From TrEMBL, chain B:
Taxonomic superkingdom: Eukaryota
CDD domains named in the record: Jacalin
Limits of the Jacalin-type lectin domain: 4-141
Alphabetized GO MF terms: carbohydrate binding
PANTHER family named in the record: OS05G0143600 PROTEIN
Protein name: Ripening-associated protein
Biological source species: Musa acuminata
Length: 139, 141
């Protein structure tokens, strides 16, 4: 079925929904003070797609999933950046290594360790920056 | 855990690991608290028979969430805090697709939240000792 957990962040920008993926290939987090946006390249029913969520600013940090490597955790911090509630920090963990968090603006933290299962996709809200972010979870 | 989704394990590494396993239907959750979350008792239905598990510690005041039919646990938030030398849950709450409960506890710490946009909590797991060190959940559509 569909298990969507989260949507950590403010209510601004526009809602986005990547839907689940067959396999996530890489994730790119662009960040400056806060988290500007995220890119996701994944395979979907034979095809290879790429989605771009969030604004266009920031510097790239890419997570490329090797063989048999999945996303088993996501954490960061929601913040009020110059007036807007947006992810000020974000990071992910694979069953092999941890990443980030990326962004230099703290706020109220969140964390999602996944004991069993994996992240198969994203959803949330974006605009000039990455306002909020959630994930799809699968066995 | 044949296709189980276990998220979390929020809290500290002390105490003993506990695992309710998934339930066919959670009937009620009772959170016992004081300065922190002492323990949690779960009454559920599994493979036909009703069961009740006791997690965490024995102290604290009872706070019960009774799920009427059609009502489900769709969220869990609280706080992880050091309490006189031990990292445990100082606060813990739950939301249902009808009403929100708690948080229960009075010690503040690093917060956490699990709003469930789609799906529900079906079980629990974590670590227990004198109090509730860590708590996590099983999810399902």
């Amino acid at each position: 079925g569909a298990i969507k957990v989260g949507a950590w962040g403010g209510n601004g920008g526009s809602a986005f929904d990547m839907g689940p993926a067959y396999r996530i290939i890489s994730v790119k987090i662009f960040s400056g003070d806060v988290v500007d946006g995220v890119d996701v390249t994944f395979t979907y029913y034979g095809k290879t797609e790429t989605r771009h969520y969030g604004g266009s600013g920031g510097t790239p940090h890419e997570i490329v999933l090797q063989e048999g490597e999945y996303l088993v955790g996501m954490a960061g911090e929601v913040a009020n950046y110059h007036g807007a509630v947006v992810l000020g920090k974000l990071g992910f963990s694979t069953n092999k290594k941890a990443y980030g968090p990326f962004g230099n603006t703290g706020g109220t933290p969140f964390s999602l360790p996944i004991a069993a299962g994996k992240i198969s996709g994203f959803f949330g809200r974006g605009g000039k920056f990455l306002d909020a972010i959630g994930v799809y979870l699968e066995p």
